[PDB]
Amino acid sequence: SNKINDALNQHYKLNVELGLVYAHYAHVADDEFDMPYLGKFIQHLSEDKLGVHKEYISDYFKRNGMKLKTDVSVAVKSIPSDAKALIQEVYARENEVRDHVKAIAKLALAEDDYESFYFIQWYVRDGLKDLTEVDDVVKLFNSSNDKLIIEETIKEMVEKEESEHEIWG
């Protein structure tokens, strides 16, 4: 499917640009908001988008004959005003990821592309996983007014040896 090749190239592009924006947001979290642990959490998110998220698509393309396209433009011209808004912006991006992944799964079924529907199940699962982790961080800013209390809870999230849920892990 050229439709599937296109939607998956779009998703590759979305994960690259997300990764670069999060790298910037990670820098701002520490450097401007004095929240280094919030920065590491977002930095880890950035390396996931620029890592397996994009690399699994290129690996898939090499298996099935689809064409990879690298066409990337992103610029960070405005920054959220504080840390809560920063992680709220992260949340909004991840929510849009779940929607685009939903379109790809729907399209693979429309095309009877059962290899692509299999492949996208990983991204269906991770769409909810990543959103859960970010939402666990959003809740902190409404559970405490002390930025060092929040930082301590993020520290444990980031340093947790993360044992993986039977379904969503």
Place this chain on the structure above:
Amino acid sequence: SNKINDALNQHYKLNVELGLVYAHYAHVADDEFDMPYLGKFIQHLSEDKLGVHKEYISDYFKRNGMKLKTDVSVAVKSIPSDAKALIQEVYARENEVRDHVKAIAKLALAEDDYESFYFIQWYVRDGLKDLTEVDDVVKLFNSSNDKLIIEETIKEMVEKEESEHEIWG
């Protein structure tokens, strides 16, 4: 120095875009040229550019008050015709990296920015290191006409537990 902040933001941008181009080149090396080990070598190069190469600058900026800028545009519209030309293109990019790094070191001395001159020594050293590794791969294509013989030599380069030279490591 705003000059130094600018040159270093330029270098951050160069390492991001290099990283993305190499990720594409890595895919093409395996998928089009049937050279998976050439792909892993270039993939490792890609993750270095998108990893410590960019992250050390953002770390530096957070230490010294310089501003980070994320403004990235790159698109891979043409691909080299064969594997030799691919790694020759990689070589040319790395050679231009050494020139830009040279300008930054010269500028830091002009500015009496001895912290920036210290910081850039890492990139002066890695400029020659990375170029050496790529040149060791370029030489292979003129030492053999058998693409599987070359692949075997790249395999050992990539899988080498790389012990680091006292000066250039």
Place this chain on the structure above:
Amino acid sequence: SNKINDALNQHYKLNVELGLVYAHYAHVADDEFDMPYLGKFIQHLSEDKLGVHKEYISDYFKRNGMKLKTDVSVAVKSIPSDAKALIQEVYARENEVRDHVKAIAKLALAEDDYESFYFIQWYVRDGLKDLTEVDDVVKLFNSSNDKLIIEETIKEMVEKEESEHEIWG
């Protein structure tokens, strides 16, 4: 160079007197401000100034024929009003350290004293390292109003098995 011998004797004197002031500030942090961990952080800073910071210069002088001078006068006649101001005063001293080190590196190049320029690279690097650690402590007082929350974060900074950055470590 007598210029270099003089600037380095000045720096030796600055590190001695800094060390003694920080020893006093460490005492005041616990004894007056009830922040024992802030005290240990500043005490560790004090022992670095009176330790390798001064001892590396005397070691250098013994290698190259320069004369060591011990001429030290310092008295702590006024104390900052609270803990935030205390660590802000520490910060200001460290910022002045970076400036004096910059003058020495500039002077060594002016003199073509490449041994002294090599020697001072350590102090160029540590100038930014020490300032980073102190600034990580300054930020705490504006991230929380609870002095025991701050103390807990300083406790982890001090007790961290500090793995050292590839460039600034």
Place this chain on the structure above:
Amino acid sequence: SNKINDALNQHYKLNVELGLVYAHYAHVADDEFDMPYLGKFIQHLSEDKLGVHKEYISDYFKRNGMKLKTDVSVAVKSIPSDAKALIQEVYARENEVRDHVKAIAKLALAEDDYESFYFIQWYVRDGLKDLTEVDDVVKLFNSSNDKLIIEETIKEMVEKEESEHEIWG
């Protein structure tokens, strides 16, 4: 007792200035007299004066409400002519330490300050310990005319895993 607070602040000052003079003497022992082991012995003495000797007083002050004062002036304007005289000068300083400590113990009893008399017992003991170690080094210069023979004996003193006397250790 303000008398005790004063005498102990005086002793703090004496240990700081002693420490700095010994650091200079350690440098001169190696650099001028070619006796690096004599230097390490004196350097170790210097770090004891600037270490537990001063830090125990500041720790005591924080426990009992006494005020710490940092008022330090010392300059090394003349150097002994040879190594024997150097360690003889060290000896004379340590002998004066024992006298000042004796005055403090006598004063604490006069004041019925039994906490201060307890505290000073450490310094009564170390006064004789330190003097013994220095005197063991003074004797060497009258037991041999060969500076390398002396250096070898000091080397073992410094490198001895020093097991501590039941009373004076």
Place this chain on the structure above:
Amino acid sequence: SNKINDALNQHYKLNVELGLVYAHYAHVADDEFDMPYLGKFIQHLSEDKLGVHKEYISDYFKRNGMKLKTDVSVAVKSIPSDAKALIQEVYARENEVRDHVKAIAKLALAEDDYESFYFIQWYVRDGLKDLTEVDDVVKLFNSSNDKLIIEETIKEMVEKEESEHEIWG
């Protein structure tokens, strides 16, 4: 830079010829002056000059396109009269090494050859290291008139598991 290529080929030649002279001096130290440990110390110096000192330049040349030249002439026609003069001659050669290295660092900056300035920092550091070790041996001959006492001290220097100084190591 052809200037840099030339100065570095000159330095390669200097290290080769130094190495061969020290090999002769090592032989004379044992065979004529009955100082086998002085011989091993000088022999170790010889193998450093003919080892990493020359090999790092050839390694550098292979990285950057500079030409290696092997043009070597040296003959040992006169021998110092005794051991003190022998190690004094060694000292004089090492002092001239520091001067030639200084010229190369100055030249690399003049040329904006920041790779060559990086490369030469190793030789700036080792220039002072090697001179320190030799000077520690020169001092022995003026600290004792007994050639076996001196030999014992050199023995420990040579057999020392040499832990390396943070700056000069």
Place this chain on the structure above:
Amino acid sequence: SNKINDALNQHYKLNVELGLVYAHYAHVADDEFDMPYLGKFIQHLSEDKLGVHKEYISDYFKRNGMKLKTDVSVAVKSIPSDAKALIQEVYARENEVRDHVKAIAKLALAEDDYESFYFIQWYVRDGLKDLTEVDDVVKLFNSSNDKLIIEETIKEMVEKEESEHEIWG
């Protein structure tokens, strides 16, 4: 024997100059012929000539009263045209080594210098050993036209834990 002293000083000179030429040839093998493993094989040969080959003679001279002479002149003005010719030139030098060693053994018997005949047996044995290793490398260039196939076989020769023949080892 002055004859033996002379022939052995000649051999010392031959091993020094051979060592320096091989160091150059090792550089050229990698840098010009893209054969780094050929370079390491020749580099190892170079360090043997400048190592035990010369050092055993100086050790012998110190035992028996013979005079050591260091008189060395060598310059590499022409380089072989390709790798095969390079290792063929190495072979020719080693073959001449066997002839000079033969003259020394013959001379020691003529002189009834049975200590020198004993000493030279090592060099009689190593003369054939070294020639065998080099000849095993010469044969490769006539067994394959692929320079990377040859390099792989040299790699194993160099990395072989070389267990030593009962006679020639």
